[PDB]
């Protein structure tokens, strides 16, 4: 009962340049859900505060880690997947879901660790986009069909 700590020591690496957020979140265009793309992120300083006065996210759900703890954490294998769907299909982007998106276009693994971010982009995307309606079987996690006819 006699001893207690009194001060804190913190040691972090030498990385100093900010992470590209406007290159990913504010890209010129996004691919279709059946042709989703993967981007590697490395040598970054990830601070989400810089998007506070410019963005508005309808969905922000994290798995295996809690929000308001990402400030004091260091990650190693960071990857980003970007695609474009309808507003009502965001609920299918979750581990263990069903629907036309969850088994034929994009499937998450069961032991998934990461976050899912979505926001509405009306008056920005006007073109025609495609998705898989049916298939002979279901997709494996983190797999892509990328074919037609």
Ligand X SMILES: *[C@@H]1O[C@H](CO)[C@@H](O)[C@H](O)[C@H]1NC(C)=O
Ligand Y SMILES: *[C@@H]1O[C@H](CO)[C@@H](O[C@@H]2O[C@H](CO)[C@@H](O)[C@H](O)[C@H]2NC(C)=O)[C@H](O)[C@H]1NC(C)=O
Which residues of the chain form contacts with ligand Y (CB under 6 A)?
Answer: 53-54, 136-137, 140
Q: How far is the CB of 137 from ligand Y (least distance, A)?
A: 4
Phi, psi values for residue 87, rounded to 5°: -70, -30
Q: Which residues are within 8 A (CB) of 126 and not within 5 positions of it... i.e. 6 or more apart? A: none
98 binds ligand X (CB under 6 A): no
Token digits for 131?
Answer: 């998705």
Cβ-contact 142, 107 below 8 angstroms: yes
Residue nearest ligand Y by beta-carbon distance:
136
69 binds another protein (CB under 8 A): yes
DSSP 70-81: GGG---SSEEEE
113 binds ligand X (CB under 6 A): no
Question: Would you say 123 or 148 has its CB closer to ligand X?
Answer: 123
**Which positions lie near ligand X, rule CB under 6 A?**
14, 16, 22, 26, 54, 124
């Amino acid at each position: 009962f006699r001893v207690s700590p009194t001060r804190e020591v913190v040691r972090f690496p030498n990385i100093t340049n900010r992470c590209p957020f406007d290159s990913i979140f504010n890209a010129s265009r996004f691919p279709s859900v059946y042709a989703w793309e993967r981007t590697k992120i490395s040598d970054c300083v990830a601070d989400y505060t810089v998007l506070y006065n410019s963005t508005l996210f309808s969905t922000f759900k994290c798995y295996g880690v809690s929000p308001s703890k990402l400030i004091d954490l260091c990650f190693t294998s960071v990857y980003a997947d970007t695609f474009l769907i309808r507003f009502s299909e965001v609920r299918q982007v979750a581990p263990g879901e069903t629907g036309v998106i969850a088994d034929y276009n994009y499937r998450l693994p069961d032991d998934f660790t990461g976050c899912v971010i979505a926001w509405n982009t009306a008056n920005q995307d006007v073109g025609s986009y495609f998705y898989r309606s049916h298939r002979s079987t279901k997709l494996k996690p983190f797999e892509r069909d990328l074919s037609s006819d």
